[PDB]
Amino acid sequence: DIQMTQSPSTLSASVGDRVTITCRASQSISRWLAWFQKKPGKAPKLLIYTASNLESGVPSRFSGSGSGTEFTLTISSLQPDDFATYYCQQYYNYWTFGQGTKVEVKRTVAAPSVFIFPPSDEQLKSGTASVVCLLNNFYPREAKVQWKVDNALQSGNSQESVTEQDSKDSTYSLSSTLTLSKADYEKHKVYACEVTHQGLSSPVTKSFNRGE
Amino acid sequence: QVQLVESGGGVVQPGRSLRLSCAASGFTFSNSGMHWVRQVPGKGLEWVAIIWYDGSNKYYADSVKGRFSVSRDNSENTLYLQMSNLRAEDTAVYYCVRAYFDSENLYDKYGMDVWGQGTTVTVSSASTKGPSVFPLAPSSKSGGTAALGCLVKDYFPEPVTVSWNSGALTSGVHTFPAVLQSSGLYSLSSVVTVPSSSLGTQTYICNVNHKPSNTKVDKKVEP
Amino acid sequence: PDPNANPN
Numbered sequence: 001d002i003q004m005t006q007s008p009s010t011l012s013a014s015v016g017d018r019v020t021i022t023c024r025a026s027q028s029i030s031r032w033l034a035w036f037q038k039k040p041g042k043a044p045k046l047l048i049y050t051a052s053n054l055e056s057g058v059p060s061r062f063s064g065s066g067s068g069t070e071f072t073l074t075i076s077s078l079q080p081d082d083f084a085t086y087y088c089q090q091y092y093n094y095w096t097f098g099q100g101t102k103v104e105v106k107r108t109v110a111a112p113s114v115f116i117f118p119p120s121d122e123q124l125k126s127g128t129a130s131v132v133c134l135l136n137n138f139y140p141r142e143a144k145v146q147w148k149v150d151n152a153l154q155s156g157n158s159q160e161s162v163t164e165q166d167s168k169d170s171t172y173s174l175s176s177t178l179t180l181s182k183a184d185y186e187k188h189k190v191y192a193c194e195v196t197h198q199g200l201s202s203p204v205t206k207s208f209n210r211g212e
Numbered sequence: 213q214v215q216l217v218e219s220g221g222g223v224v225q226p227g228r229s230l231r232l233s234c235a236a237s238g239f240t241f242s243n244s245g246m247h248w249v250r251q252v253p254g255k256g257l258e259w260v261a262i263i264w265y266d267g268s269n270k271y272y273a274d275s276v277k278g279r280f281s282v283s284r285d286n287s288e289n290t291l292y293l294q295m296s297n298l299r300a301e302d303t304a305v306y307y308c309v310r311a312y313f314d315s316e317n318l319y320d321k322y323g324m325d326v327w328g329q330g331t332t333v334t335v336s337s338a339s340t341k342g343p344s345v346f347p348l349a350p351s352s353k354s355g356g357t358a359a360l361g362c363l364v365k366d367y368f369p370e371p372v373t374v375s376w377n378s379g380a381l382t383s384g385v386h387t388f389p390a391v392l393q394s395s396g397l398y399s400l401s402s403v404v405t406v407p408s409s410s411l412g413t414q415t416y417i418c419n420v421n422h423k424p425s426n427t428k429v430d431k432k433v434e435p
Numbered sequence: 436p437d438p439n440a441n442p443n
Contacts, residue, residue: 245442
């Protein structure tokens with residue numbers, strides 16, 4: 001088992017930028033290293049093979065270098081088709097992949113707009129309460145969402161998911177759902193989601209009082 | 213074009229078996245080694261198995277050894293993966309991948325070149341179930357812009373699709389990736405931002421389609 | 436027994 005480690009895990013860049021991604025093998029793999037491009041919902045595409053040999057369909061702004069344990073992929077002038085996740089793969093001993101480096105679109109900081117949604121009366125009839133917190137159209141991706149119920153910090157009872165970066169405005173959006181039994185929901189009054197983000201001068205809290 | 217088209221994906225109960233296939237075209241299948249590779253939700257890419265061009269040599273990842281078998285029918289341009297004793301951790305997109313083809317035999321070691329688009333295998337004891345659709349109702353709880361949506365809860369298997377106003381509302385819509393709840397059922401939200409002045413007058417309906425259960429739900433979302 | 440040998 002050979003472990004492949006890529007750096008960085010995410011890189012933000014603009015069209016025209018020079019971009020370098022690194023891949024490290026846990027032991028020597030000579031030149032038996034390939035690089036793949038992968039876009040959301042699409043199969044990987046081979047870009048570089050034998051560490052530094054471009055496949056013929058690949059534009060020459062891509063290059064690879066390295067032998068032994070340290071390898072790099074360079075894009076000399078980033079183009080819109082190049083925003084993607086890049087994976088390295090060793091093929092010296094079986095086949096193992098790095099964790100991927102996402103090359104995302106850089107844009108100006110945008111604070112999220114934050115919205116909270118109480119559970120619907122329809123759902124409460126079934127015995128469950130979902131409370132939803134929406135963080136809309138923010139950049140960069142790093143955001144922290146904390147649920148507080150009568151100021152008590154919640155752990156273990158929420159799930160999150162995030163959109164892919166928007167093709168038009170390069171922002172992200174995030175949804176977090178707090179799920180309680182109806183019985184637990186009716187024991188408390190104030191339901192709050194607290195959001196921290198680079199675009200916010202201080203944490204934003206959206207809340208409601210159950211039954212109002 | 214080198215083309216690899218996987219089939220056979222679906223829902224399988226834990227402990228049971230499933231056979232995947234991959235139909236190849238655009239190259240001489242009988243001359244190429246072939247791989248299976250998977251990606252489990254939340255994990256990285258993971259090689260599964262290789263088979264030689266003639267089906268002689270076969271190798272497997274430790275995580276599937278003794279459970280999976282790879283084979284091929286060169287006369288029908290088809291690659292197979294027989295999976296047995298399946299477990300939740302085998303839930304993944306399974307890709308058929310061609311071993312690197314070098315007609316000049318230049319190099320000492322071999323990787324992969326062309327990938328198929330994959331087929332999804334879901335290992336679960338859950339039964340097909342259509343979603344409940346609940347409103348995410350707009351209230352005072354962003355100036356000229358309001359958000360509303362629908363919570364699409366407790367369905368199985370994936371996927372669901374959501375549209376707004378029968379396709380007339382697309383700007384500002386975010387439909388989120390589903391999450392798998394501890395119950396074994398999926399849940400997702402779809403939201404849209406709209407002018408807050410429109411909340412009294414413009415009707416907003418989310419249209420939810422869950423083909424596996426033949427479920428179609430239209431939910432009007434009101435302030 | 437080299438799995439990375441030429442499989443073609």
